[PDB]
Amino acid sequence: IVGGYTCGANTVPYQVSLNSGYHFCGGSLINSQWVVSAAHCYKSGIQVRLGEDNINVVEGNEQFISASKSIVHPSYNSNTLNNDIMLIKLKSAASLNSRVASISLPTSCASAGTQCLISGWGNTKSSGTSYPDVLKCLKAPILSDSSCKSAYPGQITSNMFCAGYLEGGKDSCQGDSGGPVVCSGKLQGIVSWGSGCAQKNKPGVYTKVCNYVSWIKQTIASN
Ligand SMILES: [NH3+]CC1CCCCC1
Numbered sequence: 001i002v003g004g005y006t007c008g009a010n011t012v013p014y015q016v017s018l019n020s021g022y023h024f025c026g027g028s029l030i031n032s033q034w035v036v037s038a039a040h041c042y043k044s045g046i047q048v049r050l051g052e053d054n055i056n057v058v059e060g061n062e063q064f065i066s067a068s069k070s071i072v073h074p075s076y077n078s079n080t081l082n083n084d085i086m087l088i089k090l091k092s093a094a095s096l097n098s099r100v101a102s103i104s105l106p107t108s109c110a111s112a113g114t115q116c117l118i119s120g121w122g123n124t125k126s127s128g129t130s131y132p133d134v135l136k137c138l139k140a141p142i143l144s145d146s147s148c149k150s151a152y153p154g155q156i157t158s159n160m161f162c163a164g165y166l167e168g169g170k171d172s173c174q175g176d177s178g179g180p181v182v183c184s185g186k187l188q189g190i191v192s193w194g195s196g197c198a199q200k201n202k203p204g205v206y207t208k209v210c211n212y213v214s215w216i217k218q219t220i221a222s223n
């Protein structure tokens with residue numbers, strides 16, 4: 001996250017870290033046994049880390065649960081990043097409490113102008129690199145669809161939205177991928193892609209989760 005603030009330990013209780021010997025992507029706990037992330041984060045051998053603040057220190061609220069199954073969206077296109085969403089089932093159910101909690105799925109798509117919370121452990125610099133070890137937070141509005149198609153001509157599908165600032169300076173960044181965009185207490189987006197980080201007229205692009213709610217429900221009802 002670029003130009004954000006330190007969230008504070010366990011203040012974003014649905015935030016997970018996907019680990020394969022190192023943190024490589026964020027994710028969101030949607031019930032005690034299922035995580036949703038970005039399909040471009042797909043990897044074999046995922047361990048899900050819950051209750052994290054400092055990802056390099058065991059602080060006491062962590063639960064490390066390995067994944068038993070990963071399901072990439074059946075129409076994921078890695079070239080265009082359309083349908084960049086994946087479900088991960090935990091081998092056993094997480095123990096839910098004030099610091100490890102699931103986030104609700106939307107019953108409605110969020111509108112442009114809605115302020116949201118984006119969070120993750122990704123790069124905090126738009127030019128160069130510096131990875132934080134504690135979770136970083138950023139409040140950003142959903143952008144109108146026409147300013148989104150104007151920043152990314154020919155690249156925005158109906159399954160994507162832009163969120164952030166056309167002046168730049170604040171944005172999600174590498175390593176924030178798969179992470180949550182929560183608006184009004186509901187998961188509305190997944191950190192998906194963009195052109196660099198915090199650049200002028202190049203806002204973050206996010207998977208539009210409200211389009212996938214029935215695929216998510218049906219898939220967890222059957223797996
Ligand atoms: N600024 C958008 C970021 C670009 C890196 C990958 C996640 C999304």
Ligand SMILES: [Ca+2]
Nearest residue numbers: 054057058059
């Ligand atoms: Ca830790």
